[PDB]
Amino acid sequence: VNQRMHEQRHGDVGNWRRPKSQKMMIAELAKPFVWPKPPAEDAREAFDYAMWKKQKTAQEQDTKFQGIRAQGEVVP
Amino acid sequence: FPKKGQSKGGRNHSGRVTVRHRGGGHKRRIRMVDFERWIPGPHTVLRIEYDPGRSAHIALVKEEATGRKSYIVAADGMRAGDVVQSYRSGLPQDLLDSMGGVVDPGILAARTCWRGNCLPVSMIPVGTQIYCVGSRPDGKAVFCRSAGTYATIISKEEETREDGTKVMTGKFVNVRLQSGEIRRVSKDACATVGIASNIMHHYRQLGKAGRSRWLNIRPTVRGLAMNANDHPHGGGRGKSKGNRHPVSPWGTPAKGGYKTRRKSNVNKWVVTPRVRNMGVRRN
Amino acid sequence: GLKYRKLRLTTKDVNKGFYKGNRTGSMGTHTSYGTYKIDYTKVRTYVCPDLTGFKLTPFVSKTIRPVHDQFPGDKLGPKNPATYLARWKSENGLD
Amino acid sequence: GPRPTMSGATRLVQKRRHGFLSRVKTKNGQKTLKRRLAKGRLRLSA
RNA sequence: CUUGGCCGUUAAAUGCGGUCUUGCAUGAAUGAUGUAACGAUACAACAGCUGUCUCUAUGAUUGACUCAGUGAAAUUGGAAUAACUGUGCAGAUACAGUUUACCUCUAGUUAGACGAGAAGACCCUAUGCAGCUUUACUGUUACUAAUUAUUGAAUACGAUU
RNA sequence: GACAUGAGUAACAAAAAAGAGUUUAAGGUACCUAAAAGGUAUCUUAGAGUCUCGCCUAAAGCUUAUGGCUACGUCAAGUAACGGCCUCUAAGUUUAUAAUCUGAAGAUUAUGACGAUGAGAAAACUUUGGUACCAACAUUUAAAAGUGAAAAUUGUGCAGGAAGGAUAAACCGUACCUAGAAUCUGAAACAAGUAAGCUAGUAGAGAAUACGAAGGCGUGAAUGAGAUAACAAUCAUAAAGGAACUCGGCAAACUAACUACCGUAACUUAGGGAUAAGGAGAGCUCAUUAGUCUCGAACGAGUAAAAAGGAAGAAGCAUGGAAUAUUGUUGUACGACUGUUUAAUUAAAACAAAGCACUUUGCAAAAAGACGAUAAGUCUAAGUAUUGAGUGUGAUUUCUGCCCGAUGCCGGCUGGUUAACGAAUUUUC
RNA sequence: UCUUACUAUAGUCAGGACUAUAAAGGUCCGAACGGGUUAUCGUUGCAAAGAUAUCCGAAGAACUAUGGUAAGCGAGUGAA
RNA sequence: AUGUAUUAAGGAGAGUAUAACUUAAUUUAUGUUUAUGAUAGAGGUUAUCAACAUAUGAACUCUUAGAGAAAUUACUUAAUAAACGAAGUGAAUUGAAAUAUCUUAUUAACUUCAGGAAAAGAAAUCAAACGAGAUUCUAUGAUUAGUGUGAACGAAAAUAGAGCAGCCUAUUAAAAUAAGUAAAAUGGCUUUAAAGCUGUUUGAAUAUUGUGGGGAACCUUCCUCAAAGGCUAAAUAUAAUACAUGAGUUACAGAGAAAAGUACCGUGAGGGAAAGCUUUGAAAUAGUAGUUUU
Ligand SMILES: [K+]
Ligand SMILES: [K+]
Ligand SMILES: [K+]
Ligand SMILES: [K+]
Ligand SMILES: [K+]
Ligand SMILES: [Mg+2]
Ligand SMILES: [Mg+2]
Ligand SMILES: [Mg+2]
Ligand SMILES: [Mg+2]
Ligand SMILES: [Mg+2]
Ligand SMILES: [Mg+2]
Ligand SMILES: [Mg+2]
Ligand SMILES: [Mg+2]
Ligand SMILES: [Mg+2]
Ligand SMILES: [Mg+2]
Ligand SMILES: [Mg+2]
Ligand SMILES: [Mg+2]
Ligand SMILES: [Mg+2]
Ligand SMILES: [Mg+2]
Ligand SMILES: [Mg+2]
Ligand SMILES: [Mg+2]
Ligand SMILES: [Mg+2]
Ligand SMILES: [Mg+2]
Ligand SMILES: [Mg+2]
Ligand SMILES: [Mg+2]
Ligand SMILES: [Mg+2]
Ligand SMILES: [Mg+2]
Ligand SMILES: [Mg+2]
Ligand SMILES: [Mg+2]
Ligand SMILES: [Mg+2]
Ligand SMILES: [Mg+2]
Ligand SMILES: [Mg+2]
Ligand SMILES: [Mg+2]
Ligand SMILES: [Mg+2]
Ligand SMILES: [Mg+2]
Ligand SMILES: [Mg+2]
Ligand SMILES: [Mg+2]
Ligand SMILES: [Mg+2]
Ligand SMILES: [Mg+2]
Ligand SMILES: [Mg+2]
Ligand SMILES: [Mg+2]
Ligand SMILES: [Mg+2]
Ligand SMILES: [Mg+2]
Ligand SMILES: [Mg+2]
Ligand SMILES: [Mg+2]
Ligand SMILES: [Mg+2]
Ligand SMILES: [Mg+2]
Ligand SMILES: [Mg+2]
Ligand SMILES: [Mg+2]
Ligand SMILES: [Mg+2]
Ligand SMILES: [Mg+2]
Ligand SMILES: [Mg+2]
Ligand SMILES: [Mg+2]
Ligand SMILES: [Mg+2]
Ligand SMILES: [Mg+2]
Ligand SMILES: [Mg+2]
Ligand SMILES: [Mg+2]
Ligand SMILES: [Mg+2]
Ligand SMILES: [Mg+2]
Ligand SMILES: [Mg+2]
Ligand SMILES: [Mg+2]
Ligand SMILES: [Mg+2]
Ligand SMILES: [Mg+2]
Ligand SMILES: [Mg+2]
Ligand SMILES: [Mg+2]
Ligand SMILES: [Mg+2]
Ligand SMILES: [Mg+2]
Ligand SMILES: [Mg+2]
Ligand SMILES: [Mg+2]
Ligand SMILES: [Mg+2]
Ligand SMILES: [Mg+2]
Description:
This is part of a larger assembly, with chains A, B, C and D.
Chain B: E1 2-3, E2 28-29, E3 42-49, E4 58-63, E5 69-73, E6 83-85, H1 93-99, H2 105-112, E7 129-130, E8 133-134, E9 141-143, E10 151-160, E11 166-176, E12 182-186, H3 209-214, E13 270-272
Chain C: E1 28-30, E2 36-38, H1 81-91
Antiparallel strand pairs in C: 1-2
Chain D: H1 11-18, H2 21-24, H3 27-39
One magnesium ion is lined by residues 20-21, 220 of chain B.
Chain B binds 4 RNA strands through strand 1, strand 2, strand 9 and helix 3.
Keywords (chain B): Mitochondrion, Ribonucleoprotein, Ribosomal protein
GO molecular function (chain B): RNA binding; structural constituent of ribosome; transferase activity
Subcellular location (chain B): Mitochondrion
C-alpha cells in the first residue's frame, strides 16, 4: 500500500486531510512479459512533444521562481 | 494463590488509600489454611513450612484415608511425621465401642487430647492450653491463631452424673484468651490442643529500614512533622505539640484510654473484661 | 506534540497492535495458532464471458444521432409492467 | 514555567484518553461530543 | 548584661578546645548524657601545597577591532541634550548669573541623566480577599442520650409514698 | 495596523579545521566572430567528486524503536533470516447480564466481555507440586580449547518469589530521520533530552585511560577573510616568599592508580578504626629454568613460546616514562548509621529509619481504623492480642526523678440535675 | 503522556576488593546509569534551569520501560 | 432587527465531469405552454440554445448490531443532534454601604422523562349581598394591598387585546363519583397568620329536606363551589428554511465567520484568527531635487 501526503482541502486553505491510499500488486507470471522501450525524444512528435516540452519548461521555471520567493529571496 | 493488585498498596475498590503505610513489599502467595478441620480420621504431618502471611508456622498434613493434603496452623513442638486428628465431626466407632459407654470424659481426654488434635471445647478438660479457639458451633477458628498464642479453659457449664462423672448441661464454655479476657464460647466450638508455633516471633528485630520495606510497610510520618492543614498536631515554630491532646489525623484520641468499640455493640460473651493498664509503665 | 498529532491515525504511523484493514472482505477465519484458513465460499470470482466474435464496441458512430424512446399517453412508459407482459405474450409465450 | 510534558508521548494513550470511543461510551463523553457538535467542530476527538 | 572568669592554642584570640558557675531564659521518650562507626553538614587547628596574596609578568585560543554577506532587542513626549554657584514640589543639559566650547565620527569607560526592566521591596489605607488558629460570633456533622412508630407477653424486685 | 529609533549596532564563538585541484546543468557578462551558432574565459544559482589534513569512535558509526507537517513504486503463509492481525490471560476497564444498595446521576458483588508491558505447536524444510517450580543470586552443562547467549542441572539466603489457555496460504506494517550537521520532545535549522542490538584493533582487571580500521563529519553563506589593542572568557608557565589573600584556603596547587609488598596509633558496640599513618617496588637489556610448549634425535637446543627470575647491566635530568583515579592529620557541635526533601535560589541539624513506649482492637455475622451526596460494600485480611490501627520518641551504653491540683480521657451512687413525655393546672374569642 | 504514591508485566547495573559463604552485606573503590555538593560562566543565555570542572550513590529503602489506578464542596499523592 | 409563511432529527469521512454529487458521482419518461411565451435554422462534448408541473434509476463509509484505538473488524435489507418543555436537586458572586434573617433566586447549573411543541385546562375558582364563569400568552391594575427591623420583595379582583370549545357517547375509547383521603399535632417548604406541598404520629362526614370545601388568625350565619377519577384544538416556547420591510451595516463595520468554528494555540475540556473588489490614495516615514541658512 502506498500512502498519500496529508494536504489541506483547498491546497493552501481548508482543514487538513489525507487522500485515499494507493495499492500496487506485483504478480509472478508463468510466461515472461517485456515492455517496449520508451520512444526517443525525436520520435515523440505524434504526441506534440515539442510544444509539451516548452510548456513543461515554463512550468518548471515558475515553480523554481516560487521556491526562490518562498526562501525569502529574489533573483537579482 | 497469588496476592497481587492495588489492595497490596493499601487501596480499596475506589482506588484511594484506606490503609496507610502499605505497599512495595515482596511478591507473596496466600496459603489456604484449614481453620475448620471437619474431615475425620488420622492426618500425617508431612512438614512444617514458613508462611509469609502469618507469624505462626503451618503444617502440611495428609489424610491417610483419602490422600488429600491440607494446611493447618502448626503447634509448638509439632514436627514432621506426627499424626493429628480432628474429633469435630464426632468420635470414631473404634473409640466408642472400646469404652462401651456413649462418652467417658475420663479415658476420652486421655486418648484424644494430644498436641495438634482438634476437638470440641466441651471435650477438652479444664486448665488445658489451646490455640485455634472458635466462637460459634459451626464456625472456624478465630482466637489465638497468631504465633505463641494460646487460650486456657477456665470453666464448663456442667454437673456430675451420680458417679463423679461431669456431664454438660449448658451450651457454652468459658475460655481465657491471649489478651486476658475471660469470655463465653460455644459448646461445639473449634479448639486445637497445644500452643501456636514460633513462640519467639515477638523477640525478632528487623535491624534496618529496608527490611521493613520488604515486609510491605512504608514510612510513617508523625503529625508533629506535618502542617496545621494536614494534622491536628501540625504547625508551630520548632518542635511544638501545640497543647493539643494526642489524636489521630481525624480527631480520634490516641491516648488516655478512649475506647473505639461501639457503645451499642455490647459484648454479651464477656465474663471478665480485659484489664486496662491505664497508661501506667509496665517496666 | 503538535500539528501532526491532530491528523487521523493510520497504520503506517504506529505499531503495537494497531490493525486497520481496507475493506477487502473476510476470505476465511483465523486460527488459535496465528494462521489463516481461507473459506472459498467467501472468495469471489469474476465471470467474464467469451468475447470472440463480439461485434459491439463501447462507442456508436456519430452519424447515428442520439434519440430517446417515446411512450405517448403513458406516464410510466419504459417501466410499464403491462407493456412488458403484453410484449412477452407476442414475442415469447413459452418461457 | 512550561515543561516538556509531551516527551516520550505515545499515540496509543491519545486514542485511549481522547479518542472517539472514549466519549460515545460514557455519560460525560457524550456531553463533550454534543458540545463540540453544537459549536461545529470537525475534530470531535483526538 | 558579655569579648563572664581561669587555662591551652596565636608575635597579637570577640574564635576553637578544657574547666568553674548566681542557668536574664538547661533538664530528663517536645527525652537527659557519654563513646565507636558514618557525613559533598557547621566550626577550629597543624603539616604539605600552591599566582589567594606580596605583585604581577609573558604566552595560547575564542570574542572584542577592520573588510565582505545576512540582519535583532529592550528603549523612545519632543530636543539645537556643556561647567559652576544660586534658585526652585526642597539634589537642574533646559530657570538666574557668570564662565567655557570650531563642525562630525571611531574605540574604550560607566559619574549622571533621581538610567532601563520588574507594580520588584518595605510601611500605611480599604467597613477589599485568601489560608490557618482558638475558651471570637453564628452554624453544620461525627458521636452520645431519651423516646412515638415498626412492637407482642410473663414474673419479680426496688424506689416513690 | 503601518512606519520610525536604538542600528546597519548586537549576533551568526559546542575549543573538530581546514587546504589545493576536477566536473555537471541552467543562466548572466567579456572576447573571438558578425552566416546564425560555436568556442575561450569568468561570474551567479543548484549539485557531484578526487588528493591532503583534522574531529568523533561503548560515537558525531551501523541496524532498528517511541515518534514524525521529511517523502510516497516501501513487494513476505511460516522457520532458518518477522512483527501485527488471531488464541490465552495480568494490572485494570465495562451505557453487557443478574442480584443488591441508592435523592436522580449512580455504586457494589458475581459472571461475561474487553484489556500486554507477558504466554502461544512444528520447520532446511514445517503445517503431578521438590515426583516441584522457572523470582533473585551462585554453580554446572552443546566435549580440541577459550569466550558470549539460550535452555536446563544443582545449590544457597530470606524478603519465600504471576495468570490463563493450551500444543496451499487473506489482511496490516516494511520508504527515509535517530539528533555534531537539514526530519523525534524542548514555541525553532535550539551546545538540552529520549528505547534496543551491534559497536575493528593495540593495550589493560575493565564498557577506565590513550591512540582510531571502517563509517560519518568538519552545518542550508545559519557566514567568510583579515588583524592579534584594552578588556572578558577558557587555559599554560613562573624568580624569592608560602595564606602575609579572604567573612572563610573560595578557586587553584600538592597528593593520586597498581602489587597477591612491608608496616600501621588512640579508641572501640570487638565488626571496626584501616586502603589509617608511613615506607618499598615499577620501563629497556640480560645471567638463570622444576614443569608445560616447540624443534631435533634419555638427551641436546630454543622465548621467531607463555611464564618465572636475580644484590646483573645500559642510557637519560627524569624509567607510577604520555593519558586516566584531587592531600594527610587533629579537636568539637548536630544527627547513630544507608537513605529522603522545597522539579527550577535553602540537601541540612529538617523528614524517614531500625529500636523503644503508650492507647486502642475478642473478630456472633461490622475487630478496630479508613473510604462510602449513603448505603450496600471495599481495603484491613482469606489477618486474630506475638494481629491490625493510632500517637510520641528515634540504634546501642549509662538513665529516664517530683506533681493527678488545672485540661483531656476512663470508671463509678437504687444520688442531684433532667429536654421529650407527663400526674396536677389555666386562658382568649 | 509532567509529577507524587501505588499496581501489573519486564528490563538494566564494566571491572576490582574485603567479609562467614560459589551464592547470606540498605559492605568498600570505581564506569554505565542515577543524583546535583561547590565554584566559575551564562542572565534580551545554546538553554523560560544550559555549559565546564569538582563532588555524591552506584545489589539497593536502587534505577528504567510499557500499561493501569487515585485530583479539585469533602482534598488526590506526599520518607512532610 | 422585527414580522409573515412553511417545516419538525443532525453531522462527519472518503470518492467524483471543479456550476452539475455518491463508484450510475450530468439516469430515464409524461403533460402543458413556448415570444401574443415565461416572470420553419445551427448545436449530443464545438454538448447540456427550455422553462413549469408530475413521476422515475442510482445514492458509498462512520456516528448507528457485537467488538474496537469512529470512519476498522465482522455482519446485516441493524439506524433520531442541539435548543425549547415538565418534574426532581439547587448555589455563589451581588445588595443591605460590615454581616448571619433577608436579597441575589422557585435564578444559573445538573439529572430524569417527553413531543413537535410541551405544560395547563372546563371550578371543592373568584366575588360580595350585585354578579362573573376552563387553560395559555401580553399590557394595565401595581415603585398598590401586603410582607420585612432594614435593604428590598410583592399579589388578586377587574379591564383591554391575542385566541376561544367544550365534555364523560370524553371522536378513541377513561368513573359504578373516589378513606389512610379531608383534617389535626409536630418537623419543614411556600406564605401575610389563610389556602396550597410535605416526613413522622393520628384520623372524618354523605348533598340546598343545608353533607363536605372555601370566602386570609378564629367562631357563627349566609353565599359560593362539589376534592380524594379522567379527555380536550387554538393563541405560547425553540430550531431550520423562505420571503417582506429598513433615516440597519458596507469590510478593524456587519457575525466570531463576504472561503470559519477553518487556520493556529492547547495533553485535554477548551480558546480562536487574519483575509472583499478593477476605483481613490491622507498622515507618519525614507531617498532626492529647487530656494535659502549653516
Ligand atoms: K442513584
Ligand atoms: K498532676
Ligand atoms: K485529672
Ligand atoms: K482526681
Ligand atoms: K379555614
Ligand atoms: Mg501504620
Ligand atoms: Mg514506628
Ligand atoms: Mg516517623
Ligand atoms: Mg514543616
Ligand atoms: Mg486544626
Ligand atoms: Mg520552642
Ligand atoms: Mg512510520
Ligand atoms: Mg513509528
Ligand atoms: Mg492487540
Ligand atoms: Mg507546573
Ligand atoms: Mg513518559
Ligand atoms: Mg518530655
Ligand atoms: Mg558587516
Ligand atoms: Mg542646585
Ligand atoms: Mg531655554
Ligand atoms: Mg553611566
Ligand atoms: Mg563596562
Ligand atoms: Mg552602539
Ligand atoms: Mg561593537
Ligand atoms: Mg561581532
Ligand atoms: Mg556560462
Ligand atoms: Mg504474517
Ligand atoms: Mg480476551
Ligand atoms: Mg506484547
Ligand atoms: Mg548529542
Ligand atoms: Mg527541533
Ligand atoms: Mg540539537
Ligand atoms: Mg570512555
Ligand atoms: Mg549521522
Ligand atoms: Mg569547511
Ligand atoms: Mg612562584
Ligand atoms: Mg620556586
Ligand atoms: Mg589572615
Ligand atoms: Mg588582611
Ligand atoms: Mg578547594
Ligand atoms: Mg646493581
Ligand atoms: Mg646518569
Ligand atoms: Mg544523617
Ligand atoms: Mg547520606
Ligand atoms: Mg530549590
Ligand atoms: Mg530529586
Ligand atoms: Mg541546591
Ligand atoms: Mg534509645
Ligand atoms: Mg469495622
Ligand atoms: Mg524527633
Ligand atoms: Mg533527640
Ligand atoms: Mg410537651
Ligand atoms: Mg505516566
Ligand atoms: Mg554500597
Ligand atoms: Mg553577562
Ligand atoms: Mg560511601
Ligand atoms: Mg562508589
Ligand atoms: Mg456499535
Ligand atoms: Mg458497524
Ligand atoms: Mg449595614
Ligand atoms: Mg406598603
Ligand atoms: Mg367527589
Ligand atoms: Mg393535607
Ligand atoms: Mg395552612
Ligand atoms: Mg383544604
Ligand atoms: Mg373572612
Ligand atoms: Mg370532578
Ligand atoms: Mg469582521
Ligand atoms: Mg471603505
Ligand atoms: Mg472603519
Ligand atoms: Mg501618501
